[PDB]
């Protein structure tokens, strides 16, 4: 046992020089520059719709690109597509496995996906010559539970799993095109870049990694969190992303500077973040918490600018429409709310 | 009201039909008993499943007994972190735990110092004193008891328990094991533990499970009135 020690020491010096370069390139702090700009006012958003029909805890939701339809997944073994304007139910898809943890809606609107403790990602075709929704494909590569999935197009989907790996799938052939194997813990969330050439994943090893879709390699690694990372989302520009973890803090990272920029924490907030999202302009950072309510943060000044209260249990998911018109939140109390 | 077009009214009617179907499915799901099965891989989960019913992921087993529908969920195939998905089973009627009595002298393959019985005790302590199962009863099964009788003579029980001071009598050793396991729980008021000794019993295991489930259901029913 000699060469392994030498390689570990070499890795230690490599991390040391990476840290030194990051310190050298940290000339100022985003809080130092931003202090001169005018702050946003108090955010007073009120509930506009309430969607009922789920009879168990809601775990995931996803907006459609048209900003009107959305899909929600719940432990009662059902997948419901909602019309948010009229609160009408469009479809109800009964799942083979009721232990669902994630769901995604295709950008074209033709397909929906879900997965969970069955280690299988299912694809449903919403537009058939018949009047029903039927399973189109099943992906059975992962050896752990699926935590997240996002459509690249009608034929490509990327999934994260509890087997510490992420994979890119070809739906037509049902095969693993590419595998990503950099993490050392359970991968909990992933986010797709607006141009759909890179994606970031957060794992239980308190680290985030930037992956190249085509080359199948890890481009950058980000640290700073102290507990498992539960949520992740790119800044609308695409040059930054935000992470929420169990240590009751949110952080912003820059891809070009390869380091943290701001920290969003309050001394009286001690519960972990379950979900996080940005507004259309990127000025507002919305985060769901375990203390039954969501907090609206000023993404540039790290000051709380509003609170969304009205859920009786843990807020498990939230998302913003593509036009920035509304915000939807799902909770363990089996209810979905639309905010404006 | 009258401000909706024809297609809007038809869509509303479709939504109402979907709601009715959802309510019917919810009632049907609510009429059934959910159980979580835990334990070591060789602790005897497979033989318990076979007795009740007379690749990777989650394995569901469905059986009926005296007009009650049961479905057991086996989570032995998930090697990932338990705390990230154990909250999904909050709200099960009861937890079934399986421990092999003949494990007191065997040791784990990974660590020879770490014997199987102490690992089972650690898992039981972690599961029982969990923030999500603070009000869930536990059905405990001790399986390899004929092998326990055979091995209690050649290998004394003091190997696993240094502070053991009793005789090598079989029922005394079984009582010591049951008392040691039943003392891990720290609630003692919200949680009750049902312990049973089974080796190859026929329909006795199912009857015991049914009685324990009925006892849990009675105390859950007494919560709705409020006199409990």
């Amino acid at each position, epitope marked *: 046992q000699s060469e392994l020690d030498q390689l570990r020491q070499e890795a230690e010096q490599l991390k040391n020089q990476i840290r030194d370069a990051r310190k050298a390139c940290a000339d100022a702090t985003l809080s130092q520059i931003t202090n001169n700009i005018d702050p946003v006012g108090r955010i007073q958003m009120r509930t506009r719709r309430t969607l009922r029909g789920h009879l168990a805890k809601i775990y995931a939701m996803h907006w459609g690109t048209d900003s*009107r339809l959305l899909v929600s997944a719940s432990q009662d073994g059902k997948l419901i597509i909602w019309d948010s304007y009229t609160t*009408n139910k469009v479809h109800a898809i009964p799942l083979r496995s009721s232990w669902v943890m994630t769901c995604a809606y295709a950008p074209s609107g033709n397909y929906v996906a879900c997965g969970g403790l069955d280690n299988i990602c299912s694809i449903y075709n919403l537009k058939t010559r*018949e009047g*029903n929704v039927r399973v189109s494909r099943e992906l059975a590569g992962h050896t752990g539970y699926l935590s997240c999935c996002r459509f690249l197009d009608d034929n490509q989907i990327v999934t994260s799993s509890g087997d510490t790996t992420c994979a890119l799938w070809d739906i037509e052939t049902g095969q693993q095109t590419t595998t990503f194997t950099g993490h050392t813990g359970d991968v909990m969330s992933l986010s797709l870049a607006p141009d759909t050439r890179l994606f970031v994943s957060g794992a239980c090893d308190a680290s985030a990694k930037l992956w190249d879709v085509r080359e199948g390699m890890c481009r950058q690694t980000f640290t700073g969190h102290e507990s498992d990372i539960n949520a992740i989302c790119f800044f609308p520009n695409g040059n930054a992303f935000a992470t929420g973890s169990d240590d009751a803090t949110c952080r912003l990272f820059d891809l070009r500077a390869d380091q943290e920029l701001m920290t969003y924490s309050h001394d009286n907030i001690i519960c972990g973040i379950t979900s996080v999202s940005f507004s259309k302009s990127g000025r507002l950072l919305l985060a769901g918490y375990d203390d039954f309510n969501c907090n609206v943060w000023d993404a540039l000044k790290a000051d709380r600018a509003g609170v969304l209260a009205g859920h009786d249990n843990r807020v498990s998911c939230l998302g913003v429409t593509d036009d920035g018109m509304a915000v939807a939140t799902g909770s363990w109390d089996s209810f979905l709310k639309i905010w404006n | 009201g009258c401000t909706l*077009s*024809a297609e809007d009214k038809a869509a509303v009617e*479709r939504s109402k*039909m979907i709601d009715r179907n959802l309510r019917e499915d919810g009632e049907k799901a609510a009429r059934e008993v959910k159980l979580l099965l835990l334990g070591a891989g060789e602790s005897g989960k497979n033989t318990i499943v076979k007795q009740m019913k007379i690749t990777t992921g989650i394995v569901e087993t469905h059986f009926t007994f005296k007009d009650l529908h049961f479905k057991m969920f086996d989570v032995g195939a998930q090697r990932s972190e338990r705390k990230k998905w154990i909250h999904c089973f909050e709200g099960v009627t009861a937890i079934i735990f399986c421990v092999a009595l003949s494990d007191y002298d065997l040791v784990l393959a990974e660590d020879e110092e770490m014997n199987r019985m102490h690992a089972s005790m650690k898992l039981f302590d972690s599961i029982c004193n969990n923030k999500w199962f603070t009000d869930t009863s536990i059905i405990l099964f001790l399986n390899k008891k004929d092998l326990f009788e055979e091995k209690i003579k050649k290998s004394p029980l003091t190997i696993c328990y240094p502070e053991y001071a009793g005789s090598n009598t079989y029922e005394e050793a079984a009582a010591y094991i049951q008392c040691q396991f039943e003392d891990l729980n720290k609630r003692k008021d919200t949680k009750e533990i049902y312990t049973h000794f089974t080796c190859s019993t026929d329909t006795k295991n199912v009857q015991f499970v049914f009685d324990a489930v009925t006892d849990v259901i009675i105390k859950n029913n007494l919560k709705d009135c409020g006199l409990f």
Partner: single-chain antibody
Amino acid sequence: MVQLVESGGGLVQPGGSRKLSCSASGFAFSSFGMHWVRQAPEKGLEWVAYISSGSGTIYYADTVKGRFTISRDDPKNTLFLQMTSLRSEDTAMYYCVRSIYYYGSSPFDFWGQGTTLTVSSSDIVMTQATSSVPVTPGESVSISCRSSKSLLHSNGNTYLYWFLQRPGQSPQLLIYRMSNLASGVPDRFSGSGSGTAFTLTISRLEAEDVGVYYCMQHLEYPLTFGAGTKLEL
């Protein structure tokens, strides 16, 4: 494949009764509403009756109210139309149409192959002034339809439908809600309009586009068809 097959009809004496039935296969029958549409030997389409999914809602045309009754048997995938006190003006081709209603759906998408019935011995008005437009292949032709009442609704939807009936064939849906192409319709077709005046534009005209074009309104329950516009080569 999706298939709708109607049976019954024939020759009926005046004042008699007869039941027509339609058998469906290849799709989820119980999730669709169903319509009966009529076709006089030389005139255009005429809506008769409709039944919703779950049989909760039933509507009839004014001329057949009381005389006709419509029912569906979901387990057998069969739709029924019982007629009583038949008149000499009830002779027509009776079509059966399926329609599903939700956000973004396409009603009136599939039509059956009707059966001939022969007997011995307010509402929105849809107008198609032009009755014949002689055409040549490769030419761009426009077909116009106008409505007495505005079809635009407060929700931003314009409930206008375009249909095409080839010689010796059941009508086919082309445009729904004034702008949306049907799944099988080629991209050469285009639809536009504003409230009252509507038009259908065919570009790069082929030899398979010869037939009669109909406009329909879906705003009010008494659905009405405009008199067809025939295209001749």
